[PDB]
Design a binder for these strands. Structure first.
Ligand SMILES: [Co+2]
Ligand SMILES: [Co+2]
Ligand SMILES: [Co+2]
Ligand SMILES: [Co+2]
Ligand SMILES: [Co+2]
Ligand SMILES: [Co+2]
Ligand SMILES: [Co+2]
Ligand SMILES: [Co+2]
Ligand SMILES: [Co+2]
Ligand SMILES: [Co+2]
Ligand SMILES: [Co+2]
Ligand SMILES: [Co+2]
Ligand code: NA
Ligand code: NA
Ligand code: NA
Ligand code: NA
Lengths: 221, 221, 221, 221
DNA sequence: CCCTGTTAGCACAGGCTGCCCTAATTTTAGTGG
DNA sequence: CACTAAAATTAGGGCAGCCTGTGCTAACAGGGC
């Protein structure tokens, strides 16, 4: 059928994910993350620009238009409501719902959404801690590991694991094994290479590269 | 993204659907049902034949190969397990689950399938009475209105409403309103034009064309 | 490329030719003259009716609409101006120009038409005697052998040989050999089978079937 | 009927035209010139290759087969004999004959060709200077502006204006106004962008892009 | 029968858009010699 | 200022999926002689 299921939507959500991670939305990013060639992401963006879903600014960063953002949210909303349903009701293992939802997010009707809201008791986040956007236009409804000073370790409590980390399954798995998940006290220390090392009381240590770090939100506590 | 989500799968399932209805699997049929041009379905079938999913026989009827059938079933299975999940758990309205499932059927993993089996207590049919196929290769596990003699009406109990009828949403709705659903005593009489008229005690009458009739199974009772 | 070069135009021009011959414009006719199956001419007529070029009446005879006739004339005009150019200037043999122009009639620009008018000195007929139509909307500008009483022969002077006769090349050739051409005194007598026999002083006799006869205009003289 | 009148022939002639201009015959070229999509030209070339009219070489350039070239010439021959007839006899204005012939080239019989030879006194070129090919198979019968060294202007005499230039009507018009036509002394100098500037004694200057330049043959004199 | 159409299924030529790829180049911004 | 890593562009294609125009055959339907 199609790897991504829906190219445009996956481009939009990748744009969004990058913003959520606090990194500059460049075309080069999309290529890395969706594993497509440079020429491809460029030609694809065009079609998208030509359809008023986004604009390539002066510095070349991607800017979502009024329309483009509305949709991007829409997809992200379904995505997370799905991960909820998969973990809570369906009972699918944690380190597997993201990849499943990354597909469902492109077919869930807006109706099934609403009904899922009522069946999960007006949830507000995903099994990974990220908030469910666009909940009201549907009809209802803290730092980043990179923003942590180096030097001496720090005690914090894991609050969010944005989609990007959810991507590397090998890692999202290790993190579960070492308990690094929402509402989990743990200490982190800035590595030499802009990275971050997580010290979990009881389990082996786990180090995240600068990029992966941009995708973990914690609370200084 | 794509109307059908996945063309090939929908062509396979339509082949299957026709068999289930007991009508000969011609390319002309697929074109009607998927609303595509003759040339389109032809060219698409070829690609399919070229990948050994089906063969066009001498009389030109479509025959699913060993491989093709296995996949066709896999789809039909996800389809029905989903309609189950949509009606029972999610709580989505009856005359709406089919259209929703027609899309989910192309993205549900085999894993989510199995778990849905346990969550629904090893169901064996869909909210419309059709059996869930390939349940064992997964890892677990009466007449047709056309075959009804003409003349005087006959009391029967609606047992199945195959996917074809679920298709015409306007009709599947009327049928719900008139109560014509699984385990429902009603009488049927053969119309002049090979059609069939259903007399529901209490609600307006409802007449089905010969084609739609091929898609309703009942039990002489 | 295409036998007819342009299906639609040839259908229009055949309708026109039929009128010119005084026979009823039925779809059956077009099928015979363009050598195409019944189903083909029908479906093609629909496309034409759907584009308002003609209408199928109550008796089923074909009626050219305002638009359809304007175009029809336009083609006939090019066809005849071309036959002129082919015989007078190019110098292509008589019994061959018709077939050539039947193709040129579908590519001659309206401009080349006007200039051909000046190069041939405002002609008004074809090498076969038929009048060049629509000459003013461009920008410038007697009985039928069937309508002849039977019994005793009649002296007449050949005035026109409509396209239909130009069609049968074997016949249009014999007619040339027997001198039966425009401005030629000859006698004709009605045969038993609604046909007609032409008596040419000097050459063998030549008999035309009722149909071919509908395509020859003469002057009682 | 059809924009090109005859796809295959136009493709063949475009291959020829490209060779005549000294540029590599790529599918991408055809697409540009006949204004059709990439996929279209590709699929069409296949039908052509499948019928042994051409072959796509290793470097992907198009090679006309024995048969393919014969036909190609045939079309080019008609095309030019026609431009001759249009200008000399019909009297159609210069910057208009090419477009007309581009259509007549697909319907002129081999007989009408021969006869046009005799009517134009065995011509050997077109009103633009290009030689009339395949004249013997019928039955009868210097540098390129890009190959000109840069630096100081050069006096040359325009000898040919290949079809490609005849295409851009706006340009072929200007060239007439500035007298740049066969047997015309004029000077040309290489522009920075691989282009070429023609200096006509008396009329405004005229600059041709690198591509157009590939389409003009002259004689160093 | 003969003369006219209709109904149902397909074929092949011609055209198109959305997505994706590789081989080169080019364009951006910094970076030390 | 040459040099570069990083990010894009330029060039020429590939395959999946959709369309309309034109043509044909087998079979069947109706009216009138
Ligand atoms: Co996720
Ligand atoms: Co996705
Ligand atoms: Co950073
Ligand atoms: Co269903
Ligand atoms: Co489906
Ligand atoms: Co039946
Ligand atoms: Co004629
Ligand atoms: Co014609
Ligand atoms: Co008559
Ligand atoms: Co020309
Ligand atoms: Co042409
Ligand atoms: Co060049
Ligand atoms: Na890829
Ligand atoms: Na369609
Ligand atoms: Na035919
Ligand atoms: Na085009």
């Amino acid at each position: 059928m199609n790897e991504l299921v829906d190219t445009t939507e996956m481009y939009l959500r990748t744009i969004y994910d990058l913003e959520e991670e606090g990194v500059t939305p460049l075309r080069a990013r999309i290529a890395e993350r969706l594993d497509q060639s440079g020429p491809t992401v460029s030609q694809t963006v065009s079609r998208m620009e030509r359809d008023g879903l986004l604009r390539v600014a002066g510095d070349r960063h991607l800017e979502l238009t009024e329309k483009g953002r509305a949709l991007a949210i829409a997809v992200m909303r379904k995505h997370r409501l799905a991960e909820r349903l998969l973990v809570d009701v369906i009972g699918l293992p944690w380190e597997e719902v993201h990849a499943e939802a990354c597909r469902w997010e492109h077919v869930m009707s807006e109706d099934v959404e609403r009904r899922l809201v009522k069946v999960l008791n007006n949830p507000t986040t995903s099994p990974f801690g990220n908030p469910i956007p666009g909940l009201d236009e549907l009809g209802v409804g803290l730092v980043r590991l990179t923003e942590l000073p180096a030097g001496s370790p720090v005690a914090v409590v894991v609050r969010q694991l944005t989609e990007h980390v959810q991507g590397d399954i090998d890692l999202i798995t290790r993190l579960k094994d070492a308990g690094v998940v929402p509402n989990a006290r743990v200490t982190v220390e800035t590595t030499p290479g802009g990275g971050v090392t997580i010290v979990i009381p009881g389990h082996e240590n786990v180090t995240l590269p600068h990029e992966m770090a941009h995708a973990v939100k914690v609370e200084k506590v």
